[PDB]
mmCIF file of all heavy atoms in Angstrom:
data_model
loop_
_atom_site.group_PDB
_atom_site.id
_atom_site.type_symbol
_atom_site.label_atom_id
_atom_site.label_comp_id
_atom_site.label_asym_id
_atom_site.label_seq_id
_atom_site.Cartn_x
_atom_site.Cartn_y
_atom_site.Cartn_z
ATOM 1 N N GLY R 48 239.384 232.313 178.927
ATOM 2 C CA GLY R 48 240.452 231.336 179.209
ATOM 3 C C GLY R 48 241.827 231.638 178.633
ATOM 4 O O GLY R 48 242.098 232.797 178.340
ATOM 5 N N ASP R 49 242.635 230.610 178.476
ATOM 6 C CA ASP R 49 244.006 230.721 177.971
ATOM 7 C C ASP R 49 244.009 230.883 176.486
ATOM 8 O O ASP R 49 243.639 230.020 175.669
ATOM 9 C CB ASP R 49 244.799 229.469 178.360
ATOM 10 C CG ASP R 49 246.265 229.566 178.066
ATOM 11 O OD1 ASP R 49 246.693 230.442 177.313
ATOM 12 O OD2 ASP R 49 246.994 228.663 178.582
ATOM 13 N N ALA R 50 244.386 232.094 176.035
ATOM 14 C CA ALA R 50 244.376 232.559 174.665
ATOM 15 C C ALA R 50 245.519 231.887 173.870
ATOM 16 O O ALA R 50 245.261 231.444 172.731
ATOM 17 C CB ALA R 50 244.516 234.072 174.648
ATOM 18 N N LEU R 51 246.643 231.780 174.492
ATOM 19 C CA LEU R 51 247.848 231.227 173.795
ATOM 20 C C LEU R 51 247.643 229.751 173.457
ATOM 21 O O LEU R 51 247.971 229.361 172.347
ATOM 22 C CB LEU R 51 249.131 231.515 174.582
ATOM 23 C CG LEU R 51 249.695 232.936 174.601
ATOM 24 C CD1 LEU R 51 251.108 232.926 175.244
ATOM 25 C CD2 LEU R 51 249.747 233.544 173.217
ATOM 26 N N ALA R 52 247.157 228.978 174.409
ATOM 27 C CA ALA R 52 246.995 227.609 174.236
ATOM 28 C C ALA R 52 245.838 227.308 173.217
ATOM 29 O O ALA R 52 245.961 226.465 172.323
ATOM 30 C CB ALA R 52 246.561 226.928 175.553
ATOM 31 N N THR R 53 244.820 228.113 173.298
ATOM 32 C CA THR R 53 243.611 228.023 172.364
ATOM 33 C C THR R 53 244.052 228.386 170.927
ATOM 34 O O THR R 53 243.658 227.690 169.981
ATOM 35 C CB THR R 53 242.443 228.888 172.848
ATOM 36 O OG1 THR R 53 242.125 228.491 174.218
ATOM 37 C CG2 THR R 53 241.214 228.707 171.975
ATOM 38 N N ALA R 54 244.738 229.451 170.794
ATOM 39 C CA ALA R 54 245.248 229.952 169.495
ATOM 40 C C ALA R 54 246.256 228.982 168.944
ATOM 41 O O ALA R 54 246.314 228.803 167.703
ATOM 42 C CB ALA R 54 245.866 231.333 169.679
ATOM 43 N N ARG R 55 247.111 228.340 169.706
ATOM 44 C CA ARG R 55 248.129 227.444 169.246
ATOM 45 C C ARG R 55 247.418 226.204 168.665
ATOM 46 O O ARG R 55 247.796 225.756 167.585
ATOM 47 C CB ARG R 55 249.111 226.979 170.344
ATOM 48 C CG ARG R 55 249.768 225.643 170.082
ATOM 49 C CD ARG R 55 251.217 225.604 170.714
ATOM 50 N NE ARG R 55 251.238 226.213 171.963
ATOM 51 C CZ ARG R 55 252.074 227.250 172.324
ATOM 52 N NH1 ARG R 55 253.010 227.700 171.442
ATOM 53 N NH2 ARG R 55 252.081 227.759 173.527
ATOM 54 N N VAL R 56 246.455 225.742 169.349
ATOM 55 C CA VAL R 56 245.756 224.563 168.907
ATOM 56 C C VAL R 56 244.954 224.876 167.612
ATOM 57 O O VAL R 56 245.032 224.049 166.667
ATOM 58 C CB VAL R 56 244.851 224.008 170.050
ATOM 59 C CG1 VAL R 56 243.950 222.943 169.594
ATOM 60 C CG2 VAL R 56 245.749 223.429 171.193
ATOM 61 N N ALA R 57 244.269 226.018 167.610
ATOM 62 C CA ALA R 57 243.491 226.442 166.398
ATOM 63 C C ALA R 57 244.375 226.484 165.127
ATOM 64 O O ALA R 57 244.007 226.062 164.028
ATOM 65 C CB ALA R 57 242.786 227.796 166.681
ATOM 66 N N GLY R 58 245.497 227.183 165.299
ATOM 67 C CA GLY R 58 246.513 227.265 164.243
ATOM 68 C C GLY R 58 247.055 225.957 163.702
ATOM 69 O O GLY R 58 247.171 225.742 162.565
ATOM 70 N N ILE R 59 247.450 225.059 164.689
ATOM 71 C CA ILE R 59 247.937 223.791 164.371
ATOM 72 C C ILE R 59 246.895 223.014 163.496
ATOM 73 O O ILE R 59 247.265 222.390 162.432
ATOM 74 C CB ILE R 59 248.359 222.931 165.565
ATOM 75 C CG1 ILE R 59 249.708 223.424 166.056
ATOM 76 C CG2 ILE R 59 248.464 221.440 165.194
ATOM 77 C CD1 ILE R 59 250.027 222.927 167.536
ATOM 78 N N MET R 60 245.637 223.029 163.939
ATOM 79 C CA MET R 60 244.564 222.397 163.198
ATOM 80 C C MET R 60 244.316 223.044 161.887
ATOM 81 O O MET R 60 244.037 222.430 160.892
ATOM 82 C CB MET R 60 243.257 222.436 164.067
ATOM 83 C CG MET R 60 243.415 221.537 165.310
ATOM 84 S SD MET R 60 241.914 221.509 166.307
ATOM 85 C CE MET R 60 242.473 222.449 167.726
ATOM 86 N N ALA R 61 244.429 224.383 161.795
ATOM 87 C CA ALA R 61 244.132 225.133 160.578
ATOM 88 C C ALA R 61 245.197 224.840 159.478
ATOM 89 O O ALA R 61 244.883 224.750 158.317
ATOM 90 C CB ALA R 61 244.177 226.664 160.829
ATOM 91 N N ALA R 62 246.426 224.579 159.913
ATOM 92 C CA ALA R 62 247.501 224.117 158.992
ATOM 93 C C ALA R 62 247.020 222.873 158.247
ATOM 94 O O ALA R 62 247.195 222.821 157.052
ATOM 95 C CB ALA R 62 248.755 223.840 159.748
ATOM 96 N N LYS R 63 246.473 221.872 158.996
ATOM 97 C CA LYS R 63 246.024 220.628 158.387
ATOM 98 C C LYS R 63 244.809 220.785 157.453
ATOM 99 O O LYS R 63 244.621 220.033 156.540
ATOM 100 C CB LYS R 63 245.715 219.607 159.436
ATOM 101 C CG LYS R 63 246.966 219.075 160.229
ATOM 102 C CD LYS R 63 246.647 218.057 161.256
ATOM 103 C CE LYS R 63 246.299 218.697 162.599
ATOM 104 N NZ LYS R 63 245.692 217.734 163.550
ATOM 105 N N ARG R 64 244.088 221.861 157.657
ATOM 106 C CA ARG R 64 242.792 222.183 156.897
ATOM 107 C C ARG R 64 243.058 223.088 155.712
ATOM 108 O O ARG R 64 242.077 223.469 155.000
ATOM 109 C CB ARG R 64 241.814 222.778 157.799
ATOM 110 C CG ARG R 64 241.488 221.973 159.006
ATOM 111 C CD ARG R 64 240.022 221.980 159.331
ATOM 112 N NE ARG R 64 239.589 220.895 160.151
ATOM 113 C CZ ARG R 64 238.563 220.174 159.936
ATOM 114 N NH1 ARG R 64 237.730 220.411 158.897
ATOM 115 N NH2 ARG R 64 238.290 219.107 160.713
ATOM 116 N N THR R 65 244.291 223.395 155.437
ATOM 117 C CA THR R 65 244.586 224.442 154.354
ATOM 118 C C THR R 65 243.885 224.189 153.053
ATOM 119 O O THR R 65 243.284 225.066 152.472
ATOM 120 C CB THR R 65 246.170 224.654 154.175
ATOM 121 O OG1 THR R 65 246.734 225.126 155.410
ATOM 122 C CG2 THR R 65 246.451 225.634 153.068
ATOM 123 N N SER R 66 243.954 222.882 152.675
ATOM 124 C CA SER R 66 243.383 222.497 151.374
ATOM 125 C C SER R 66 241.867 222.555 151.402
ATOM 126 O O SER R 66 241.206 222.722 150.346
ATOM 127 C CB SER R 66 243.928 221.141 150.903
ATOM 128 O OG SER R 66 243.385 220.081 151.710
ATOM 129 N N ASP R 67 241.253 222.454 152.608
ATOM 130 C CA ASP R 67 239.823 222.623 152.804
ATOM 131 C C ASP R 67 239.418 224.068 152.532
ATOM 132 O O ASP R 67 238.216 224.329 152.237
ATOM 133 C CB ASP R 67 239.449 222.253 154.281
ATOM 134 C CG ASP R 67 239.535 220.799 154.541
ATOM 135 O OD1 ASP R 67 239.918 219.977 153.730
ATOM 136 O OD2 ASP R 67 239.211 220.371 155.773
ATOM 137 N N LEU R 68 240.310 225.036 152.804
ATOM 138 C CA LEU R 68 239.954 226.403 152.856
ATOM 139 C C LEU R 68 240.345 227.200 151.608
ATOM 140 O O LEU R 68 239.584 228.022 151.074
ATOM 141 C CB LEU R 68 240.700 227.123 154.037
ATOM 142 C CG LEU R 68 240.416 226.605 155.480
ATOM 143 C CD1 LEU R 68 241.453 227.067 156.455
ATOM 144 C CD2 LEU R 68 238.985 227.102 155.861
ATOM 145 N N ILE R 69 241.565 226.888 151.114
ATOM 146 C CA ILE R 69 242.110 227.564 149.921
ATOM 147 C C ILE R 69 241.853 226.736 148.752
ATOM 148 O O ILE R 69 242.601 225.706 148.570
ATOM 149 C CB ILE R 69 243.581 227.948 150.234
ATOM 150 C CG1 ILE R 69 243.659 228.588 151.571
ATOM 151 C CG2 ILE R 69 244.075 228.848 149.156
ATOM 152 C CD1 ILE R 69 245.074 228.999 151.976
#
Side-chain angles (χ1 to χ4, degrees):
Chain R
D49 189 347
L51 288 189
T53 304
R55 157 148 38 236
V56 172
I59 284 163
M60 294 180 251
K63 291 181 272 169
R64 303 221 158 223
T65 297
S66 70
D67 291 1
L68 297 166
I69 311 180

